[PDB]
Amino acid sequence: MVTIRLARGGSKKRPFYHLTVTNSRNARDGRFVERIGFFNPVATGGEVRLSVDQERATYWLGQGAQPSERVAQLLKDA
Amino acid sequence: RTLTGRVVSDKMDKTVTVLIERRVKHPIYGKYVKRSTKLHAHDESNQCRIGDLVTIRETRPLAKTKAWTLVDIVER
Amino acid sequence: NTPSAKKRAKQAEKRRSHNASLRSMVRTYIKNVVKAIDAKDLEKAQAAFTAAVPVIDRMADKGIIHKNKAARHKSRLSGHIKALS
Amino acid sequence: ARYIGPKCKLSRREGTDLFLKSGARALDSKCKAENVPGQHGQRRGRLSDYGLQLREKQKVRRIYGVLERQFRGYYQEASRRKGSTGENLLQLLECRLDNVVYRMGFGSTRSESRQLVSHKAITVNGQTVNIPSYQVKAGDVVAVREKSKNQLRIAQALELCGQRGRVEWVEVDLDKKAGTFKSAPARSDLSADINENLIVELYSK
């Protein structure tokens, strides 16, 4: 299956996720089909937490992309 | 995609051989050399002569080392 | 080791022995047709061809031979019966 | 690592005032700045041509208190920016926080301003900064923390502002002790003894 899930970038104790669409049998930090947004939990000041783009998420979700548990709510809270 | 060369061989059976010249440039000295190319175009009717000027195109492989075919004979 | 690889080990010969019976049966009903061609037999091969088409295709949807392999014998063996006319 | 030791002795080799001692008592009375230091303080002659460029670079590097690992770091940010690396090298040494505390006049020496930053007594945007490398911007309201507004180190130093004047890119308020860094300096308030065409040429070869 293909799936929409979260990567992990940044230092220790300061994460920064990436909404990628990947084949399911890959690594976390490995290859991907494309990337559509990010998610910053520790965003402070001028930083933006959610930055999903609704165009490609309209495209992939109509072709059987299967989201994760956190991405079940982040697309919902837009 | 369509190439052009001249025939050098008629020895095999339903199989012709072309020379495709080419001017590549040298990567560091800025000069256009000539370096050749020699294919095995699939002849079809055993009717080309040594010294022609023909036209080839690419198909699926027919034997091994023979994937190009013959479009048409341009000039003698 | 595991107590789960030793289960997939026992579960391999129970299918290896089972698939071999379903696989060799196909080949006996095909060699009956080919040995009947070589003796220039028109009606002997025609009877063997009739009762071997259902054996091949019923062994195709079980998943023993692939469905494009069963599509290949039926085309070629018809091409040798029309060459006896 | 700072420099802890004698401080007339640095002013005594380069042969200038250099503004290192604190009070307005006297130059060349605490110091005796007539000679090169050491035993052979009388013999002189023919500074080498390489030795002139190193003497100019070491002069600018001892006014402010940097070390060379930091100083080459400022030199990279000079050559990154657009145009006139000599002026840009100075304006990254003017915007540093231990300089601006000295320009406002919250200390006698420049090394006193380093200690007032280091003990969390200085704020920048309303929040505490204790780093003597903080590059301030245009319009940062440097103020003094209320727990130490009664220190005589700050009160006495404002009478030492009389022999200095205002540098006309700051403004200081002698009641609430809240300076305002107005804008960047120009290449007119800096003294002509420093040379922006010897330090740049030293870091080529």
Next chain:
RNA sequence: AACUGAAGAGUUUGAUCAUGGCUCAGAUUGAACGCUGGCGGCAGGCCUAACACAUGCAAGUCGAGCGGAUAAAGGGAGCUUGCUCCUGGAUUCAGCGGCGGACGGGUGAGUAAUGCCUAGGAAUCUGCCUGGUAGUGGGGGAUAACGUCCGGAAACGGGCGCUAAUACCGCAUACGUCCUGAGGGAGAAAGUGGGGGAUCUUCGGACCUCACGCUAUCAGAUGAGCCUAGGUCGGAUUAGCUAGUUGGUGGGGUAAAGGCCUACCAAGGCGACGAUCCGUAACUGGUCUGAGAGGAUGAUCAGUCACACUGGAACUGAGACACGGUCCAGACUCCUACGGGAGGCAGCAGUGGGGAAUAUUGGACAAUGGGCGAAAGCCUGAUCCAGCCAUGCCGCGUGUGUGAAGAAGGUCUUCGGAUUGUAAAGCACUUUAAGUUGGGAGGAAGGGCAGUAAGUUAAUACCUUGCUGUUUUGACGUUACCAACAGAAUAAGCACCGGCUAACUUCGUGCCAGCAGCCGCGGUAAUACGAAGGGUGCAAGCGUUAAUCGGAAUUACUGGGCGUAAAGCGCGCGUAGGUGGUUCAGCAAGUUGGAUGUGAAAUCCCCGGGCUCAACCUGGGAACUGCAUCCAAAACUACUGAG
């Protein structure tokens, strides 16, 4: 958003100009060693023996697939405090099954080629996902468990007897599937669970509905297999190499084109544009130097390939010729009742060995992810976190002010003094980090339970979904961070000082010991050896060694030379190849301009944004010089036609 840097010196000579070597100043490393040693962030840590391995752990999960045996609560009775039996039954897991172990983690042995990059295309496949479409009718024979017997030192093996399934196999039907020449012919399936109006009935059940699962098939994404063209290290003191070899035909074989394979036919194929052979090496996006052109190099991170003690081989399956699978042969350890067996850390730790040299037998599933079940849950040595090591980059401390009797004390001296030096001492203040005490976020999204509203329906029963209410969850952790208390207390070395090259004099030593990157010093006055004062460079580091690129216009495309410094074949003729006088005309292969597809993300660069700053993290752009397909222009080169 677009964007700039190029240094020289010493050494051949009585001296000079030139040619030409050598050596130094720079920035860098998975670095090692010597001296010295406060702190915290963010990083990295077997480059050598792919050399053997003690002991722990690294892939299992489903009782809403089916047997079986454990049988609670409770319903109890009875008998006299406890047992008896009964009744239901919640739990629980050895077995059959469905899935998954082909993903994730590790290492660089092999391979000089279509392996890997870039551009293309045609002959195929694809479990789980999405969109559809047509179904989900009936029937039979076995089998483990469990019995029981027999054999084995074990590791286990054998026999007879019994039972079930979504296990397995016929039969029935079928497009919108396969083959066929139209004509015609061939092929499937599995049920469990929540409910329930009516009705048949032991609501054993049928029944209706819902969720789930299964069977054909078309399309979409995703992954995979093939073919062409080009590029891809040194050696010419390696020049010929090859009979499935190179084509054709007939037949097989594989998901799929092909000498892939075979039977005859034919005598071809490649090669100085370097075949063949030898020697070494995993490639790539990138890193390190450079002004640039280039030159070396492929640690960590990412993509691709290749292996899993050595050599083979297939099965199972959607997809392996399979790191914790099977069979065989070999080598090597271990067990044994001597008959036979067992095992594979190039998974995480760890031991031995090698070596100039490289870390703890940690903590957890809370986070992000995977596998199974979607019902919660369960597994996870990949992940997220701690421990060790100045192994690197970036930041902060080791106090601040005043103070000349210019004190002792030291070294030198023309004996007058000079210098160490406001430096100390003395006096007045300051308390970050470290220490101590109190306080204290953010990483948490959910799940349970209850309620309610929507749509499913025959039945707002169940269930799905909004929402409400209530309750529960963190390895890190004594969290970052904040406040208070103590007091200047808790905290500086290392090389060098004749010239290149910043910085100097006395004392020992006398061709001895010794020094050294090059010039070269030392024979009794040494600014070069050994010390002492003084001084200069750098700092929590400083030095040497090893190794690349610069400087080297010293392999010169950008950017050199050949009368005498090294360098014009003894002279001809000439094949491949390189270059082409002059007018028109055509053409568009080069060439210029433009458009589209591509050039993975990271890295570098530019403008911003977050951590008290910076390193670090991160948003938007440019760039990736390329290759391909189209459109136009026609000066010059090419090709063509005429002079």
